[PDB]
Design a protein around this motif. Structure first.
Motif, PDB file in Angstrom:
ATOM      1  N   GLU D  79      49.976  41.356  15.471  1.00  0.00           N
ATOM      2  CA  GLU D  79      49.686  40.775  14.165  1.00  0.00           C
ATOM      3  C   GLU D  79      48.191  40.785  13.872  1.00  0.00           C
ATOM      4  N   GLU D  93      58.455  53.634  22.004  1.00  0.00           N
ATOM      5  CA  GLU D  93      58.917  52.255  22.065  1.00  0.00           C
ATOM      6  C   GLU D  93      58.399  51.570  23.320  1.00  0.00           C
TER       7      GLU D  93
ATOM      8  N   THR E  93      77.829  64.506  27.657  1.00  0.00           N
ATOM      9  CA  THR E  93      76.590  63.741  27.590  1.00  0.00           C
ATOM     10  C   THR E  93      75.460  64.638  27.105  1.00  0.00           C
ATOM     11  N   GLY E  94      74.758  64.190  26.068  1.00  0.00           N
ATOM     12  CA  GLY E  94      73.617  64.914  25.550  1.00  0.00           C
ATOM     13  C   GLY E  94      74.004  66.036  24.609  1.00  0.00           C
ATOM     14  N   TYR E 120      68.131  65.292   9.228  1.00  0.00           N
ATOM     15  CA  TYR E 120      67.581  65.661  10.530  1.00  0.00           C
ATOM     16  C   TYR E 120      68.121  67.009  10.996  1.00  0.00           C
TER      17      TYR E 120
ATOM     18  N   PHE F  16      61.535  41.201  25.545  1.00  0.00           N
ATOM     19  CA  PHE F  16      61.540  40.014  24.700  1.00  0.00           C
ATOM     20  C   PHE F  16      60.832  40.242  23.373  1.00  0.00           C
ATOM     21  N   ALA F  17      59.998  41.276  23.269  1.00  0.00           N
ATOM     22  CA  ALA F  17      59.291  41.557  22.021  1.00  0.00           C
ATOM     23  C   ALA F  17      59.072  43.063  21.935  1.00  0.00           C
ATOM     24  N   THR F  19      57.762  46.118  20.324  1.00  0.00           N
ATOM     25  CA  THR F  19      56.740  46.454  19.338  1.00  0.00           C
ATOM     26  C   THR F  19      56.439  47.943  19.267  1.00  0.00           C
ATOM     27  N   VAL F  43      57.909  63.816  15.287  1.00  0.00           N
ATOM     28  CA  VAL F  43      59.088  63.154  15.838  1.00  0.00           C
ATOM     29  C   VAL F  43      60.354  63.841  15.350  1.00  0.00           C
TER      30      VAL F  43
ATOM     31  N   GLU G   6      73.774  60.004  25.902  1.00  0.00           N
ATOM     32  CA  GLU G   6      72.532  59.251  25.820  1.00  0.00           C
ATOM     33  C   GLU G   6      71.823  59.575  24.514  1.00  0.00           C
ATOM     34  N   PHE G   8      69.280  60.367  21.424  1.00  0.00           N
ATOM     35  CA  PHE G   8      68.279  61.388  21.154  1.00  0.00           C
ATOM     36  C   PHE G   8      67.836  61.255  19.706  1.00  0.00           C
ATOM     37  N   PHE G   9      66.637  61.762  19.422  1.00  0.00           N
ATOM     38  CA  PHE G   9      66.002  61.609  18.115  1.00  0.00           C
ATOM     39  C   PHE G   9      65.955  60.129  17.724  1.00  0.00           C
ATOM     40  N   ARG G  10      65.194  59.383  18.516  1.00  0.00           N
ATOM     41  CA  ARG G  10      65.042  57.959  18.270  1.00  0.00           C
ATOM     42  C   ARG G  10      64.122  57.716  17.082  1.00  0.00           C
ATOM     43  N   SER G  11      64.435  56.677  16.317  1.00  0.00           N
ATOM     44  CA  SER G  11      63.636  56.246  15.180  1.00  0.00           C
ATOM     45  C   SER G  11      64.139  54.874  14.765  1.00  0.00           C
ATOM     46  N   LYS G  19      55.338  53.102  -3.592  1.00  0.00           N
ATOM     47  CA  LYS G  19      53.936  53.257  -3.212  1.00  0.00           C
ATOM     48  C   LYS G  19      53.082  52.133  -3.780  1.00  0.00           C
ATOM     49  N   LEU G  32      56.431  41.553  11.340  1.00  0.00           N
ATOM     50  CA  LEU G  32      55.876  41.714  12.679  1.00  0.00           C
ATOM     51  C   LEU G  32      55.685  40.366  13.364  1.00  0.00           C
ATOM     52  N   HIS G  35      59.148  38.807  14.260  1.00  0.00           N
ATOM     53  CA  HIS G  35      59.589  39.490  15.466  1.00  0.00           C
ATOM     54  C   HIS G  35      58.920  38.881  16.684  1.00  0.00           C
ATOM     55  N   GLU G  36      57.589  39.023  16.729  1.00  0.00           N
ATOM     56  CA  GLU G  36      56.808  38.757  17.933  1.00  0.00           C
ATOM     57  C   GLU G  36      56.908  37.303  18.371  1.00  0.00           C
TER      58      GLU G  36
END
Lengths: 231, 276, 144, 101, 125, 51, 48
Positions: D79, D93, E93-94, E120, F16-17, F19, F43, G6, G8-11, G19, G32, G35-36
């Motif tokens: 923050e 992550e 898997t995968g 995607y 636990f957090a 981020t 990505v 498992e 894949f392509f995490r987001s 805007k 944020l 969350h924290e």
């Protein structure tokens, strides 16, 4: 019936069938039936444990592949080898990720293709990388050491020549003809294709106790006879 | 392979070695010691009960009666439990191990030497107008002049018919055959020789007759092989489906035959003893 | 193979398991295998895969040979010359890059730097690298 | 990475040592995709950041005093950190975890 | 039942035990007693009436007991092997797994026609 | 990549957090949008898992 | 049904404005900090 009852209790588990156990109490009989069931459960569990121990027969985890972590990140356990810095160190230097790990092996390089193969049998260093044919023959003939992994940098051998000489085309044509004709397969058959290459320990490391007990049985019989005769 | 390939291992058991004979003589000595202690008709009963406890307690006997005899009987029973547990563990270890077998184990063998006067004659899958046909024709004509009766259309038709069961074995280039074996559904197809070749030679990007391109192309391609691109590209484009991913009636026929022979020998001995 | 010569100097009397004599030749390889010694020219005996292929080749077109083993004993790479700033080819390949040279024939691999200066021929084998480690000793045989 | 000793001898120089890893690769790819040159240099004056006496101790301080222009590395979003300097989209992550032998 | 090994194994074993009992009684010359003893030995039942006449019959009985123990051990080993063959199915898997990287005839898989995973996907040629 | 994996982090990574890491920047820097979409493309176009 | 394989392509998910929004920075800092300080864990335990 103390001896008879003791033998009965001792031999029920082993299915000895002494038949000398006839206790008066019926509750004792029910407890004995439950205890026989318990003992059979125990022996089944013991068989299961032995089966599990046999199934888990893969404790060693020798390194495999080219990019395995114990190779990409060397440790102090064992050392590698490069055989006199020729035809392999060039390949390692050309790359990058291996070149990171090349510094560790940059000084422990040997000076021959036989001193290193002796040192492995001397248990001073256990890691070697060389041409496939040489290592394969040395594994087959010397049925003491075994090599694993997957092949890489698949480049064959070759006769040499110099710059521009009037022999090259004829020699290449002849060696190709020898390949096709079947000469090379026959020659490889007769030079490097075959050199040399309830366990017995089960009743080797166990039956000694049975033999000793059998031998001492005469001594035990004499002891019992003396005990009976003295008083 | 027509059906599943498994190893019965009827003669591959840890028996038929020195360990079994040593155990037999050891148990004979143990039985002799037990008889000596018991004496300090019953010998035959002792042998019968020893053999039973070696097999199972399903054979009652009243031969032994004593303290030391009971002690050694208990010890020998414990060894019997140990032995049966060891046999079970060994059989389980055999169960977790499996190996397959080949069919010809060689190109210039007897099977492809005289198909006529050896079983139903085989079928030699080959395609005309190619390198392999030329090499086979130039090497030895007999196999070629027999294989000329079965020249399939292309590649797909040949192994489709073979899977249907019309043909017997296919002779073709090794790389495409390896790819097809790795790719086919069910993994019911495989090379007779596990990675065995006969006339190993590489492919080639055929230039012209002396064009001034050879040096640059050769150097560039050798650099490509050295740099490791070829391995990754082969992994990306050329990989099989399964490939790298690794008590029947007749499984104990030898034991049946041995038991029958032993029974016949016992009957012959009984007849001789009755005569004698 | 490199074996010491006999008293008469004519290494012979070796028949193969199939009932045939294994061909042999004469090499002038260095006497003292160890370094720091009075190196000389022993007339040792050589025979093997490579020599058999060489005999076949020699009979094939036409020539005679005087096969002699290398000086240093190393395959050949590139290293900058000491007490200078130039580079030269050491070991066996250096011999090919000099007067002796001719037709080096041995288990010599194919590379890029090597292919840059000299020309090769089509291969007569195929090999990988096959990491080698000492074989483990199994201690579990139902002994305990 | 600037090399400095200690005490009166703390006046050192800037020895040249070149670095590599994971963040370097994404930085290189970013430079390739956006075509901008750079003069990457380490710092030894503190850590990722710790607000002391209402002033910033390097790292975030270097960005917040217009001395540098990015802080590619192992920064963590928070923050207060996002309050004093802008951020970019997170690319891996992470959080807090427990690990005892 | 003993289908994992063979039903024909069962039939052959029964034929063999009956034939061996028949010939064992023949060589001694209590046929019902001999058959009961033979069945019990291969069954641990222990009828208790067994009494060999000749020492050759005794050796035949010992060999029969050994063969019965071997058969029991083989059957138990096969049953354990079938037990350890549990879960023959393999997990898809995968995205790199060949069974999914190589599609098949049916393989009924889909997604939302107006999703974002399509955005995607189409970007990945 | 521990010394023979003698120890393992307790729990299934239940942070636990949660981020996440990130590249910092100046206040109102001109490059912010460019590198933001560049990272999003990176990505998206299968490179992060490779690294 | 099962969740084999498992990821894949995490987001991530999120909240999106235009805007020109008078809340984007404020809403981002608020989510944020929530969350924290630990607000999400309560909801994930309660609902999913």
């Amino acid at each position: 019936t103390l001896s008879s009852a003791m033998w009965f209790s001792w031999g029920v588990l082993l299915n000895s069938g002494i038949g000398e156990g006839a206790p008066r109490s019926f509750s004792a009989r029910i407890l004995g039936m439950v205890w026989a069931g318990f003992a059979m459960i125990i022996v089944a569990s013991y068989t299961a444990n032995l089966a599990a121990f046999l199934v888990l027969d893969r404790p060693e985890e020798r390194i495999t592949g080219i990019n395995d972590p114990r190779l990409r990140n060397p440790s102090d356990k064992f050392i590698y080898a490069t055989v006199k810095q020729s035809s392999v160190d060039i390949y390692f230097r050309r790359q990058v990720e291996l070149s990171t790990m090349y510094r560790h092996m940059e000084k422990h390089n040997y000076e021959s293709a036989a001193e290193a193969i002796q040192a492995v049998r001397d248990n001073k260093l256990h890691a070697f990388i060389w041409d496939s044919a040489v290592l394969e023959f040395e594994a087959s003939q010397k049925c003491d050491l075994v090599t694993t992994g997957e092949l890489f940098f698949r480049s064959g051998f070759g006769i040499g020549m110099r710059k521009d000489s009037p022999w090259k085309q004829n020699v290449s044509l002849s060696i190709l003809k020898s390949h096709e004709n079947g000469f090379m397969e026959d020659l490889d058959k007769t030079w490097v294709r075959y050199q040399e290459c309830l366990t017995f320990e089960n009743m080797a490391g166990v039956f000694m106790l049975v033999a000793g007990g059998i031998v001492a049985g005469i001594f035990l019989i004499f002891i019992e006879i003396a005990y009976k005769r003295h008083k | 392979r027509s059906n599943g390939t498994v190893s019965p291992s009827a003669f591959l058991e840890p028996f038929s070695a020195s360990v079994w004979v040593m155990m037999f003589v050891m148990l004979l000595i143990v039985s002799a010691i037990a008889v000596f202690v018991f004496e300090y008709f019953t010998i035959g009963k002792a042998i019968w009960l020893l053999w039973g406890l070696v097999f199972n307690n399903s054979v009652p006997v009243q031969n032994p009666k004593g303290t030391t005899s009971k002690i050694m009987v208990s010890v020998w029973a414990f060894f019997a439990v140990i032995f049966l547990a060891s046999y079970t563990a060994n059989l389980a270890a055999f169960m977790i191990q499996e190996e397959f077998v080949d069919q010809v184990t060689g190109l210039s063998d007897k099977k492809f030497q005289r198909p006529h006067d050896y079983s139903p004659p085989f079928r030699f899958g080959t395609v005309p107008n190619g390198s392999t046909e030329r090499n086979i024709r130039n090497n030895y004509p007999y196999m070629h002049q027999y294989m000329t009766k079965f020249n399939q259309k292309g590649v797909e038709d040949a192994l489709v018919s073979l899977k249907t069961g019309k043909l017997d074995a296919f002779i073709y280039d090794a790389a495409v055959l390896n790819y097809k074996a790795g790719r086919d559904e069910g993994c019911k197809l495989v090379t007779i020789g596990s990675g065995y070749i006969f006339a190993t030679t590489g492919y080639g990007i055929a230039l012209q007759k002396g064009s001034p391109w050879k040096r640059q192309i050769d150097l560039a391609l050798l650099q490509f092989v050295g740099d490791g691109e070829m391995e990754e590209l082969e992994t990306l484009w050329l990989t099989g489906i399964c490939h790298n991913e690794k008590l029947d009636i007749d499984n104990m026929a030898g034991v049946f035959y041995m038991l029958a022979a032993a029974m016949a020998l016992s009957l012959i001995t009984f007849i001789w003893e009755h005569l004698f | 193979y490199v074996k010491p010569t006999l008293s008469d100097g004519t290494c012979k009397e070796e028949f193969t398991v199939n009932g045939d004599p294994v061909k042999k030749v004469i090499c002038t390889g260095p006497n003292d295998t160890s370094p720091g010694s009075p190196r000389h020219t022993v007339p040792q005996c050589c025979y093997g895969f490579c020599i058999d292929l060489l005999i076949k080749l020699a009979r094939t077109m036409n020539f005679t040979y005087e096969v002699h083993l290398v000086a240093d004993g190393k395959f050949g790479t590139q290293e900058r010359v000491n007490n200078s700033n130039k580079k030269e080819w050491n070991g066996m390949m250096g011999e090919l890059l000099s007067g002796q040279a001719d037709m080096i024939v041995a288990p010599l691999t194919i590379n890029n730097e090597r292919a840059q200066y000299i020309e090769f021929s089509k291969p007569f084998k195929y090999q990988g690298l096959t990491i080698l480690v000492k074989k483990e000793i199994p201690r579990s045989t139902l002994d305990s | 990475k600037f090399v400095k000793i200690n005490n009166s001898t703390n006046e050192g120089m800037n020895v040249k040592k070149c670095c590599k890893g994971f963040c370097i690769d994404i930085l290189k790819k970013l430079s390739r995709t956006v075509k901008f040159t750079y003069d990457l240099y380490l710092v030894t004056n503190g850590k990722h950041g710790k607000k002391v006496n209402n002033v910033w101790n390097g790292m975030i301080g270097e960005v917040v005093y217009q001395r540098a222009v990015m802080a590619v590395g192992s920064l963590t979003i928070n923050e207060e950190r996002s309050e004093v300097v802008d951020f970019s989209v997170p690319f891996v992550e992470t959080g807090i975890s427990v690990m005892v032998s | 039942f003993m289908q994992p090994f063979q039903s024909t194994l069962w039939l052959l074993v029964g034929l063999s035990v009956h034939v061996v009992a028949v010939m064992l009684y023949l060589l001694d010359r209590t046929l019902s007693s001999a058959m009961w003893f033979s069945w019990g030995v291969l069954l641990n039942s222990g009828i208790g009436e067994g009494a060999p006449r000749s020492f050759s019959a005794r050796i035949l009985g010992m060999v029969w007991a050994g063969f019965a123990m071997i058969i029991v051990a083989s059957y138990t080993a096969n049953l354990a092997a079938f037990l350890v063959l549990d879960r023959p199915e393999e997990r898809i898997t995968g995205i790199n797994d060949p069974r999914l990287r190589n599609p098949s005839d049916k393989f009924i898989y889909a997604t939302v026609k107006q999703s974002s995973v399509d955005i995607y996907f189409r970007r990945q040629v």
